[PDB]
């Protein structure tokens, strides 16, 4: 069911924060553990701020904290070009339950179209189920990202789900879950943008995990 997939997502969601060494942590959004010490996280969380690699990355797992130098996480792309969401290996994180097999297969994408979905996310750790209207797939999705100084950048990704719904700051990094039980309520991807009553999630397929 949607709810049982949501439970698996919830257990693997951690809070992602960034701070200077010896500084205060800025909690930015969610990251989703997928397998071993690998997580999915929107790279827009960190990559557009100055000297990201000199920062400390923080992972809050239910009130237990795991920090690491940004230079010591291994970032892997989902595909060629910029997709925002990346795979990130964090050596200090406890091993995650492998949920990769709950992600949609590339070939099954059409089966999630025109059907409801649920964004399974948190706002700073408080779990939320956010209803999304019948889904469409945008071959190229463009959305705004607001940086720390209030200025904005326009990001474009390949293959992003679009659904009617209401998002709030911090929900990025949550997982979109299909209402379609015939594909076992597959995880469709990762929430990257919200606004104007539209929710955008980068498609993440099972096949993408082959990239390590
Ligand atoms: C949610 C996970 N499920 C999973 O990996 O299913 C794989 C499967 C299930 C049934 C038949 C073939 C393959 C889990 O934690 O098990």
UniProtKB/Swiss-Prot annotation:
The active site is at 44 (for protease 3c activity), 84 (for protease 3c activity), 172 (for protease 3c activity). It is found in: Host cytoplasm. Residues 1-209 form the Peptidase C3 domain. Homodimer; disulfide-linked. Cysteine protease that generates mature viral proteins from the precursor polyprotein. In addition to its proteolytic activity, it binds to viral RNA, and thus influences viral genome replication. RNA and substrate bind cooperatively to the protease. Cleaves IKBKG/NEMO to impair innate immune signaling. Cleaves host PABPC1 which may participate in the switch of viral translation to RNA synthesis. This is Protease 3C. The chain holds residues 1520 to 1731 of 2227 of the full protein.
